[PDB]
């Protein structure tokens, strides 16, 4: 009974890099406030 | 320094969960 609206999803290597940098820098920024 | 002890897990999860999400998406992109 296969559903036709399904789609594959993609994340290219450059987007991985940008995303990882965003998360790391965000963590570097907020961690001081988390430790307080 | 008398920091908040929950700060460590908050920071670790803040990094780990989003990062793992991206890695999962990237690896399965490469294998098709």
């Amino acid at each position: 009974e296969p559903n036709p609206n399904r789609q594959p999803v993609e994340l290219n290597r450059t987007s991985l890099y940008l995303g990882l940098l965003l998360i790391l820098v965000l963590a570097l920024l907020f961690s001081s406030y988390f430790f307080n | 320094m008398e920091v908040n002890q929950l700060g460590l897990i908050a920071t670790a999860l803040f990094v780990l969960v989003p990062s793992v999400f991206l890695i999962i998406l990237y690896v399965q992109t490469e294998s098709q």
């Binding site: 290219n12 290597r13 450059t14 890099y17 990882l20 940098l21 790391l24 820098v25 963590a27 570097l28 961690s31 001081s32 430790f35 | 320094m1 920091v3 700060g7 460590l8 920071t11 670790a12 990094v15």
Partner: peptide, 30 residues
């Protein structure tokens, strides 16, 4: 623990720089 955490995050970023530069997806003309 908080010093270790800050240095850890910073070290990951430096590692990310290495991969982003030397293991980038190469731009190709086409």
């Amino acid at each position: 623990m908080e010093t270790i955490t800050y240095v850890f995050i910073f070290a990951c970023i430096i590692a990310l720089f290495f991969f982003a530069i030397f293991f980038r997806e190469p731009p190709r003309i086409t």
